[PDB]
């Protein structure tokens, strides 16, 4: 994790990720209107202020 925090059911998620055989990602298609999606912190540094 990059931002300071922790998961819950950490070992359960880790075991299902080890048994995953890799990750295939589908774009969930969530389009957000009325608000902004640009939140970032200095803890994550890709080219400066970034986030996930």
């Amino acid at each position, epitope marked *: 994790v990059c931002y300071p925090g922790k998961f819950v059911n950490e070992e359960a998620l880790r075991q299902i990720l080890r048994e995953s055989g890799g990750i295939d990602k*589908e*774009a*969930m*298609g*969530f*389009t*957000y*209107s*009325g608000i902004r999606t640009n939140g970032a912190t200095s803890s994550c540094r890709r080219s400066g202020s970034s986030f996930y």
Partner: antibody, heavy 119, light 111 residues
Framework: QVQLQGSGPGLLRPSETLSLTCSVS????????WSWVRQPPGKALEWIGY???????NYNPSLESRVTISVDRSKNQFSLKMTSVTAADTARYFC?????????????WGPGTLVTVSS | DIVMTQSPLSLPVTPGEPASISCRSN???????????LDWYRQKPGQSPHLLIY???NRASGVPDRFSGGGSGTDFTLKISRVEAEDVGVYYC?????????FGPGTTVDL
């Protein structure tokens, strides 16, 4: 915020295969699955069918066989083709996405590609 | 095929009054989550429509305060608090439960 844009032939004779195209920005047919509608001229509006961005298709039991929705993964425009066109199907095709499939952000309905079916 | 029953037909509204249009079908409309799939549309003639209310009871994005219409069960009603000059346009209500999708006959509201 995606931007939808449609294009295609207007003066078309009946019976032959119809062509249509529709360009989008932003989502790039990579995340959400778009659908299709059809506008009778000053009559009741109805729905054509949805196509998953992957390619799975579903339609209206009013009309199945004549409609073929293009997938077009690589190019950033998804298209529509109709066979056996009719002067009763002289319509104002709209190109869009809808609330209820999972996205709750309006429709971003594309412009009206007006078509006329006459000899 | 779920045939959609709009009511009423047309609203010759006066400027500045609370108006309302109902919407019902021959089914109970409820999703598995508990959130009803009902939409409210607004098509200016000669131009693409717009959504004003989504998910039944819920305020939509980019939509100001005069539209928050709800209801109960399978008959819902869009409420319009103030009538102004730009409220002309044909209105549609729409389910989202299952295929197929049947739009409404239309509500030609005018002054």
């Amino acid at each position: 915020q995606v931007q939808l844009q449609g294009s295609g032939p207007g003066l078309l004779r009946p019976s032959e295969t119809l062509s249509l195209t529709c360009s989008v920005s932003g989502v790039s047919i990579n995340s959400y699955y778009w659908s299709w509608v059809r506008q009778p001229p000053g009559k009741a509006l109805e729905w054509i069918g949805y196509i998953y961005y992957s390619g799975n298709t579903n339609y209206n039991p009013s009309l199945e066989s004549r409609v073929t929705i293009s997938v077009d993964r690589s190019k950033n425009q998804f298209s529509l083709k109709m066979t056996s066109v009719t002067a009763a199907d002289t319509a104002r095709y709209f190109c869009a996405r809808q609330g209820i499939f999972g996205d709750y952000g309006s429709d971003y309905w594309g412009p009206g590609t007006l078509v006329t079916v006459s000899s | 095929d779920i045939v959609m029953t709009q009511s009423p037909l047309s609203l010759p509204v006066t400027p500045g009054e609370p108006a309302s249009i109902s919407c019902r079908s021959n089914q109970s409309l409820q999703h598995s989550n508990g959130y009803v799939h009902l939409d409210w549309y607004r098509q200016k003639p000669g131009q693409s429509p717009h959504l004003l209310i989504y998910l039944g009871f819920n305020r939509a994005s980019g939509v100001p305060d005069r539209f928050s219409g709800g209801g109960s069960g399978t008959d819902f009603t869009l409420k319009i608090s103030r009538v102004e000059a730009e409220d002309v346009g044909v209105y549609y209500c729409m389910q989202g439960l299952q295929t197929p999708f049947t739009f409404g006959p239309g509500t030609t509201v005018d002054l």
